Symmetry: D2
Subunit: 321 residues, 4 copies
């Protein structure tokens, strides 16, 4: 399939490189993160990707406790991204990096990126760190409501990307560093953060919000029924502030991508849960090979009509292209 | 379907009853947990369940920090269960409650339950608490290897059941108590505990072990591919002690049940990931209605041959009930 | 789900009533007749109780397609269409109509479709497979040359064509000899309709008229499950197909066809279809009165698909297709 | 996956070679002829390269079923079976055999099956649909009364019967008139075989002989997808079916049939079949030489199913069915 749109495609600036074992693989990953116009573009041309929506790596800004520095790095990453997109505006679009440890500053930067730089959304690596940085700040909190109101006003999607939990909140993984990151920790952290947004009633207040999750929903589709229906015999209204069910907000305010989850069985389950209209192709490059993502997607067992929607038209519609 | 086997069916004793909002629902749940020979049996007769493998509620013994007390309560709960099953041996089987905060005591009690009481396995509610009870004790730790060796020798399954993480290990849920328990926390806690067992190399050392997970695998099937294959271009071997991949241990040493997860889409995904031969019917009664579980299972969209296997024969084979 | 659209819902006129006599055993015949003749009463009450807002009505089978005499066929089609228009006018907010066509006379059929669409406001046509004409001993399929003008008009009017089943003629039914239970909905209906559909595709009809929309009931008459094989059998042979059409069967099926859930309330079948043709081309339907409306609706309300797709398959796909 | 078992793998003898002519034009015909006549060389090299340990061989089609003269049919069947036995003996560790049967003569077919199984060690029979006999203008289906003794012997010998496709006679193919491209594997093969299978079911054959094992290729010739409708159409009518069988079509399909992946390398189709008949009754097969072995193997190695089921469908279901353990 040609003309695909991919939207969990990362790059980095020297300031955030460290954020992402020594040897040839680490050297290659660094090269990939810094490259946009050469290797990346050639792979897009060879693997049917017309549009790549770029985003800064992780944890990047979300791991910068000093709001002053976080704002600085965010603006810097966004300016660099704007310059890179300008080189091939027919192929590259961008997601804004935001200094959410400072709600007002984040709202202002999103406005600048969207209104002045033409960015089409925001990508944030989970909770923010601020001050001593020992407290994970989730976006369902009160201080972020004004921000969400602006996101809805600008009407651009918010990509809730993973990050690892803080050490004090990672004891279950002690002795197992191999369970951190994309193996598992990333999914748990992101899935719960998403559930917090839903449970808080954020989508009752701002029903037009569009949230995007990668890695096929971080496991949510498979357990969505249970999330709402567990202990069904108990006919008492849910205790959370949100007015409806989790499945309602997931079905109406979320979209998921195939980033780093090239599994047909997983895609089929998602198609039967959230629907093909809300699944988007993505690769997670440079952490995943573009050819791996594309070759899998070209052959996965779905209707050709859905391969076109998931690979291209769903995204073009979502980002008003 | 008649003649089903259900194996995540709970009961409680006064001592552990408290482990399980005020009103009529709370009163009903308590009654259900204390009943075995009446209400429960009538529902089994009405909903095609021939065999029910019983287990104590949660967290129960795993939440008793004092080793002596934990050993006492486990003992009491197992003796009570043994007596209840003896009243109707053709309908009730039992899972042992174990005081794992004391590895040796736990091994001794499992042998006692299996060899002397005829129990067919063990059910443990996640990590154990001991001493000050502020440290979650996972079973992949070195001190539990002798125990696992005995489990394999006795050749009985180990049901790794959920429990909530300790407060200091649940900040991500702060302000959202509705995310604890069956809504989500139970799955994360159990899924990771299972992955720790796999990564530790436990199944290389004891390959004949049979581990059971409820709630359709606590989310594992859907993300299993990613667990091993993420960043596939990096051809460097994983650094965990285990010699093979997570999918290998999941496919070879685990079985999942339908407890509290009556969703056809989820069952189809599991069938295409772990296979119908490793999926077992279960309800999670009394936390779930038996009729809800049975009615869903009778109509779910699978082959009739698989409905027979998942509903009865997989369990009969696993617990050697045909000989 | 409320607000559903159903489009394989039948009725009969006195002149075609007996055609359904063999569909059900005795004792049930009286009830089936009542169902076929009723449009405004029981039918509407079932629609209100089972979340159906719009019902696109069609004459029963084989009806017009089994009338060998051209003059008579044209007469019955016009009468059936006039009656249907009268019935729809009584409850225009709930009933729409498919035209009955005397295709044993191409020109007349073309004229009648135009009348139904332009003057009566019908939204498409429903035809029970091949036509019989003259001695009526030869099945007339619509891929034949004489029907090209007709298809051009269908495309011009831009209304869908529902290719409904009918049993093959006795001389073309020997494989079922001694097994009358295999005729009809059990199996014969599907084979007859599936192949007729393939004949249309292979003939190149959709190369000539790419905007045509064909609808098949009973979840595609078995086509989705075997579609890959239909094109890819003997794939090692790198030679072009031998039929007139320029492309593959899957292309025409994916681009010119839609299938309904009529009389095939099976979740596994629906999942396969979703993974082959896609939810955007699957439509809810019941096959009332040959199938119970409650059976169709209750199954559809609980089938294992995404809620977004339940809305599309149950309502929006049809509203989009019929420009409602 | 290595160690697979494939069971819809054909060959031909000079006497039946022309039956496969019409299929491919030129050059491809030369290649197909080579493939059909070869058993020990190219075929074996492909098995070694594509993880196939066991290949259960069968004569091509329609072959014996299209020989109306009883004596000639018996002769050709015996000749094909003797050649097959000789070929299998060259490499018994890799090749097994299905018997060709002269069913236009029930007693003769019964005797030949006994000879093949008891004396030649064949593991089953493969028949290309209905038989032609005498004037050959009437399709002879195996649900007919005269074949009951034969079926009783099949059950006694306890070997599977592979009901393979064939095209219907011209007078029974008018629906395909003008569309020769719809005959054969494109569609006609499936319709012919699916209905023949339903006739066996409806006749009550499996009530009388419940231990029979029937095998269908091409993923069941379309049956799984429409199985619910076959039994449940017009469900509101609460009256029993009119056929002689005591139970439902789905019951006989579930209990007496097995389907193979021959010439139907489609994951969606396999998933539907897994959710209808179950992975325990699906078997890997290729339909070589009409289909490429690498096409079948490559698809099966990557299809979206549980690894445990890949092992069963690719090898253990067959080994259990043919008692190879
Ligand atoms: Zn990423
Ligand atoms: Zn439980
Ligand atoms: Zn109909
Ligand atoms: Zn074949």
């Amino acid at each position: 399939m040609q003309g695909k749109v991919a939207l969990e495609e990362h790059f980095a600036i020297p300031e955030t490189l460290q954020d992402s074992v020594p040897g040839d693989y680490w050297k290659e990953l660094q090269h990939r993160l810094l490259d946009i116009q050469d290797t990346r573009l050639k792979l897009m041309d060879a693997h049917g990707i017309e549009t790549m929506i770029l985003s800064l790596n992780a944890p990047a800004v979300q791991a910068i406790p000093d709001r002053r520095k976080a704002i600085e790095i965010a603006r810097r990453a966004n300016d660099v991204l704007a310059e890179e997109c300008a080189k091939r505006p027919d192929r590259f679009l961008a997601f804004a990096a935001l200094p959410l440890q400072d709600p007002d500053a984040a709202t202002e930067e999103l406005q600048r990126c969207v209104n002045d730089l033409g960015f089409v959304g925001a990508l944030v690596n989970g909770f923010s760190q601020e001050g001593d940085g020992q407290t994970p700040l989730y976006y369902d909190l009160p201080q972020y409501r004004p921000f969400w109101g602006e996101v809805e006003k600008l009407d651009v999607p918010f990509y809730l990307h993973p990050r690892n939990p803080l050490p004090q909140d990672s004891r279950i993984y002690d002795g197992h560093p191999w369970l951190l990151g994309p193996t598992w920790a990333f999914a748990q952290e992101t899935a719960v953060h998403a559930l917090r947004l839903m449970a808080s009633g954020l989508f009752d207040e701002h029903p037009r919000l569009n949230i995007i999750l990668g890695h096929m929903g971080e496991g949510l589709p498979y357990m969505m029924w249970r999330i709402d229906h567990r202990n069904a015999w108990v006919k008492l209204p849910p205790r959370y502030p949100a007015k409806r069910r989790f499945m309602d907000y997931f079905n109406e305010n979320f979209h998921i991508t195939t980033s780093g989850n090239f599994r047909t069985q997983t895609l089929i389950d998602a198609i039967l849960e959230i629907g093909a209209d809300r699944i988007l192709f993505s690769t997670d490059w440079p952490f995943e090979n573009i050819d791996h993502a594309s070759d899998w997607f070209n052959a996965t067992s779905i209707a050709e009509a859905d391969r076109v929607k998931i690979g291209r038209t769903n995204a073009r519609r979502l980002f008003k292209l």
